[PDB]
Symmetry: D3
Subunit: 309 residues, 6 copies
């Protein structure tokens, strides 16, 4: 898929732009927004075509809110605002956002330039609330120094885990994406030993090998984020997390972003993480990282997105 | 589609070679031509395999006259010679050619070497009448200075536009391709201002953005080459244009090469360009660009190409 | 096909690792091997995910004997051990192997690391019996100096040639791989003129152009390995050969590895090469190449592999 | 020069980190700072070595201020705080900074990681005041869409323009660097025509050709920034400007950073720019860009830097 | 040596452009040419700065006649027009050229753009008389199939070979370039066996290994082009040859371009090639290659060029 | 230093080949050896020229015994056989070799092909006694998992450390090189914890940071291999180590290869490693690493190498 919007299954990139906007209530504002997103291939190609490789992509997400202002008579089975969470020790907020632009490419400039054009073409119809500049950190690691994205599904597995299928035929090819902008306590995480961090995560640090069944804490991030139903079948998400940061504000982030054909799966994950399972037995990763955003979007197929207004 | 002939859908490349030949009148000549072209996979792999990336591609096209010499009793539905056009100041001549080899690669040497092996296999059975060595010019710009190919369709839309379908099943997967070798008047074009040049084209020069509707001349290249039928269905073509030129002979060129499932679309675009819409409202790009060739070829699918003889 | 096990159709790579292993006798050995190979995408992702490009792949093969030790319930239609061949001048031995890991990547480190992890996780449950580190040699050449892999099928022809289909649907998506480690007699090869070598292979050397029909000897490698059935349809295999060797031992090698949906095609190529067509008209490439191994494996699809 | 600090003459990079810090008054603070900078090759190599190419570099700059707290008995001929400017229309501030880290590399991660380690190793001894993440924007352009850095000197020319020579023998191999973090008025600049912008700058936009003597405004950025002494000899700086920005804050920047063997040259340039020459005839670029920082640093040779404390 | 004019010592590149021009008669022509060439680093930076890598280079050469039209005050010690050679079978013509632009870059677009700019800025003051777009061919080969440039001197030997020194200090840092556009007779070359071609060149074809002393013919290109003085010291030139051609015209070419601090070395190679050593023992490469141009230029250092 | 033999200063590469040979006893053997090695530029270019980047390099080294057979009456000042060491549990054996070819390239095939041509030119006049195919392992790490070569000197410092100077003018520009082929006990090493492994080495594992003084064991690899003379002058060596190994034979290796103007420095480092400082305080890396070879070679400059015979 070269320079098509709503390409959910694109592999990891060296650079990322995550843009979250809220729209004006204005019916002008709402129509401008609809011109821009419904013709998103326009700027995508306009920018992306300028690089031989065509690495640029752009997934547009529409919040449950704004989706209702533009398509009253039609709705995907699982679209809703982000379910906030209140656990024993840690809390997942549910912040504002109508529009998500998930931009990826082999270079920063291509990313930013597409962002410049999307923002410029929306003028006053929308306002940027969250902006993360994602980046690859060494051999695909988060700023906690672990290889990040290892166990994502691929090929058919990824398509099945992430894209709306027969189960909701009106919106085939779409997805539900949840973002959370985590900031990290670097000095705290650094007081742990490698082995403790490995215990927290679920896998060895340098070698990125998953720990044995008998060495794996019942509250390792891995165990918490593994989902098996009654019949014995696993359910996966597709994560496109990037690192970001600012040195003189001491921010060191993991930008979480997970796509799934049904947000139930992501949501259960988030519950097992914040509330724990057994309850109270929560995800130790949360000790070292706090969510500062939390938002859910529907990712329309190319067709659905092209008809809006 | 790695090292397969008739890969119409290949993304743009850094180098290309376009060869147009005329076949000898003889029965020998016809048979040699058929062997070489029906067996084009041989040279394709012989050269292309030597590069790890396998970037080399080769699309063979056959003119209407030569087709009738070779397969009298089976003809793709829309194969006819190039339709010349004559406006009051600018014309599209119809120039000879029985064979097109449209060759693309990441490097010159690959395109050249394949050309050599093809020309050599053809020996005296065919004669080159046009030869153009295409090259990528900065960030996918043409010699007029504009990003070039921005609006080409990709993925499914590309297949939908370029490749014969249910309409003409005996040749599904083939295409119709048109070439025109345009030379530019750089002087005249340079005496325009950027803002005028943009008005000629239909997009901003540097940033490659489409001009919005109320700033968009009715005889802009973009506008004139937009094809919406009465039912409001858009009809696209697939363009693999490349810069080319010679400093000593002051040639600065654009090699037009457009693929379509039905050449009616390409031909309509052309008639809107040369004869204007409404009539006399011609494409100002033609004030600065003069076509020296105009030839139409049928691009058979692999199975059809392999059967020839 | 990013970071998936059993990706038979991957394009060529700069580096590869061919690992052949024998499994231990015990039921415990059986289970450790089965546990490792069934979860192969674990290590495959553990190392592969670390390279932006995602070039790393890993095809697992299972030999007939070991397949029987895990699944006498159903067998791929053509799975059997490798058939030795004993020709008038040269022979192709049949040699042990229970498991094959055919690993490809853009970098040696990735192949090596994935191997390290696989070999480690198998521990005493298995023994490496052959190991060769392949590498690309100039413009896709082999150590004999010829461009090597030119006429592989690609795209659909590749899938039609290599992947088991309707003809054996319980194992749809798998394949049959045959491997042979060849060592060359370099001085003997260099006593030939370029023209003689071209007549041996059946293509020109520098340019890699097929010799035409009447300059083509009947015993050219290319002729002997052309398989056309009674209806005129050609049957192709998919070869992922790499160069290897060792300067100190004077080993200059071609690692042959050929995938096919029906290994009789590959086997018939072998018979025509070793015994000749007509008999005695054997492949003169064999006058400069001696095969030190010979092993056949079934390549389960992801589904069947995951269930093992 | 692979992985050596104070490598002033390294060619352009795809990524940049500009860090400006101020030090604590604390004599601990001052000694920590001196350990970190005097052993700067330590973290440079620690990070840089991890990339085969070794693209990472780091120039340390020491403000005139702090330089005096650490080397009382020795001073470079032209070290002083940044001379602020007050012109007819526009003003160049002179902001705080003791330490400059000019970091460059082929990737973001390498940049940031070196920054992480420099900041972490300074702990509370210093505080980040300015942090710019530089990036390459297309074919070496600033966010004003012009090719940026064209006329820099190279080879010997660059060494002579930038490195302290015979004229101040104690500090041979060092440099004076001035930074200014400009923000741009994008909507204003976009109301000009290409030709007007060309007039402002001095060179053609797309083609990056310098205008003819007779077409060149006496107040084009180029003319203002050309320096010729009494004898007829030119004097050049070496600029390593990068683009940066933030979309939802509408910041679009040129991070200016010029090295010279004598800041007189940079300073005269800045005067001709802000005050004009003839006076009042100032640099039109200033209409569309405002300096939000202004700081001057001495760049010690490797030897001088290694002995500090 | 990033984006500087007169960088003779640049390594090989994927693409090059060779432009030969004649200047107009008028004094106005003289001044426009001089203005353009003296400011050559303007366009060189205007296009070159646009590529991150900075691969673009541009060497300017000035012919003897035009040099005289601008500087009869001082002449490089060896500057004279190219000497035609008329041998027993083959001849090297002397053909017009007042200016040479030898442009190299990693990409065609850069070479082309710099040429566009140069040719434009010269307008009617000059005329392009020869233009060839060179390209790398496989693993540094020429269209005859041999690796081409193997024995160029490098590093210091390169500077010692190519750059004018103490022997003519008013022009320290310059050089002398000779260019000849050769066209090959491909069918004739292909009637030779590989062994015959190797004996012509003096190296093996695929492997690019020098033939040893007793398999080396006396009229091998390599032998004829070895220049050893009476004290035993070898004298080398620096060649930046590229392939070119046109499929429709059947032109398959080698663009010869040789730099030396003293062009008698290059000239003596030419005489030994065209007339033979001993006489009549000429270079059999010339039985397959015909030179269509022949021109000598002085390559001013940056300083002398800037002052023109 | 493009395609020149004896380029000791080459930056690290992705592939290498180390060959150690013993010369035949004969006069023929000696003369063949001298021809091949004095003419090594031939094979170097023959192979290396075929790659555009020209990454291929080849450094020839000559052992003390063979040197004395070849140039009896002229000997670099410090050429002697490798000095064996025997600690109580760990030893450095002294193993045969008259010739070293240290070959580096960006690709395996280049290193291999050069090796072939060299081994073939030598024929029966020499026999390979050690052959190692080095490869870059992730981000310049060795098989123990640590970034490896971090502290090598670069630029002038490298030249200063590695290359014979005024001390021994007849051989200025040469060097002395020592090789040791170490095999690791991966099991034993893996039973350590990261923090212990770091203590063994002297730097953090993942982030490659030097441990500060008060956390830095006196028998850390780093500490023991730091060489300060009485005058406080540091003495460095240049290391081109590479990973290597064989999965079937459970070999996981580090090929040590250190260059020095004076081997006294390398030999002292070694004696501090094997015999400890103070005595018995040995380098714990040796608990996990066992050397199978130990050979010293003189690396002549080009002019000297070319004269041999
Ligand atoms: C601070 C934020 C986070 C960090 C630093 C983090 C880091 C990790 C790491 C190091 C792994 C192991 C390697 C891999 O497969 O990617 C992992 C796996 C995973 N993570 Fe998290 N993660 C974070 C937040 C989350 C959140 C909020 C979710 C769910 C909404 C989540 C879902 C998963 C899933 C589904 C896997 C695959 C586990 C498996 O099946 O083996 N991650 N992440
Ligand atoms: C004469 C030389 C030509 C030049 C310099 C030229 C230039 C351009 C440029 C700069 C664009 C905008 C970027 C893009 O989407 O490709 C464009 C678009 C287009 N051109 Fe042309 N062109 C030429 C000949 C033609 C011809 C002969 C045809 C039709 C037969 C044509 C059909 C199109 C089409 C279909 C588009 C996309 C229109 C849209 O839907 O936005 N081009 N061309
Ligand atoms: C908003 C800030 C600025 C922008 C966007 C800007 C942009 C430019 C552009 C487009 C050029 C022409 C191409 C080139 O050679 O780089 C240029 C040249 C130059 N600039 Fe500026 N510039 C800025 C600030 C400055 C400042 C503050 C100085 C002096 C302190 C300066 C010194 C120069 C010099 C010395 C040249 C070379 C001119 C020549 O000799 O031809 N720039 N800059
Ligand atoms: C046995 C296998 C070996 C392993 C795994 C090993 C590992 C290391 C590592 C991980 C470093 C830190 C990164 C760096 O600066 O290179 C290091 C530094 C060093 N190593 Fe070793 N090494 C080995 C053998 C040796 C030997 C035999 C010597 C001396 C003859 C040695 C001399 C050094 C030196 C001089 C440094 C830099 C010390 C400093 O000044 O910080 N290495 N080595
Ligand atoms: Cl961005
Ligand atoms: Cl995650
Ligand atoms: Cl071509
Ligand atoms: Cl077009
Ligand atoms: Cl390996
Ligand atoms: Cl084969
Ligand atoms: Cl950064
Ligand atoms: Cl500037
Ligand atoms: Cl060109
Ligand atoms: Cl030559
Ligand atoms: Cl090797
Ligand atoms: Cl070491």
């Amino acid at each position: 898929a070269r320079l098509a919007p709503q390409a959910v299954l694109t592999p990891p990139s060296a650079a990322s732009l995550f843009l979250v906007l809220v729209a004006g209530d204005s019916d002008d504002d709402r129509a401008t927004v609809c011109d821009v997103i419904s013709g998103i291939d326009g700027p995508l190609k306009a920018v992306g075509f300028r690089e031989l490789a065509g690495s640029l992509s752009c997934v547009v997400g529409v919040g449950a809110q704004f989706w209702d202002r533009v398509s009253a008579s039609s709705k995907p089975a699982h679209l809703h605002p982000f379910v906030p969470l209140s656990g024993p020790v840690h809390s997942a907020p549910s912040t504002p956002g109508d529009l998500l632009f998930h931009i990826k490419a082999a270079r920063k400039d291509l990313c930013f330039e597409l962002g410049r054009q999307i923002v410029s073409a929306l003028g006053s119809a929308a306002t940027v609330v969250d902006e993360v500049h994602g980046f690859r950190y060494f051999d695909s690691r988060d700023l906690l120094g672990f290889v990040a994205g290892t166990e994502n599904p691929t090929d058919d597995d990824a398509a099945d885990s992430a894209l709306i299928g027969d189960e909701d035929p009106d919106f085939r090819g779409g997805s539900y994406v949840i973002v959370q902008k985590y900031l990290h306590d670097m000095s705290a995480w650094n007081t742990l030993s490698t082995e403790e961090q490995e215990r927290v995560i679920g896998r060895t640090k340098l070698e990125n090998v998953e720990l044995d069944d008998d060495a794996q804490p019942s509250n390792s991030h891995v165990t918490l984020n593994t989902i098996v139903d009654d019949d014995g079948v696993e359910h996966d998400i597709l994560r496109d997390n990037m690192a970001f940061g600012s040195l003189g504000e001491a921010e060191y982030g993991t930008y979480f972003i997970g796509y799934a054909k049904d947000p139930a799966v992501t949501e259960l994950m988030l519950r097992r993480m914040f509330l724990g399972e057994p309850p109270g037995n929560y995800d130790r990763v949360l000790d070292f990282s706090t969510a500062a955003t939390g938002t859910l979007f529907f990712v329309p197929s190319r067709d659905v997105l092209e008809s809006l207004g």
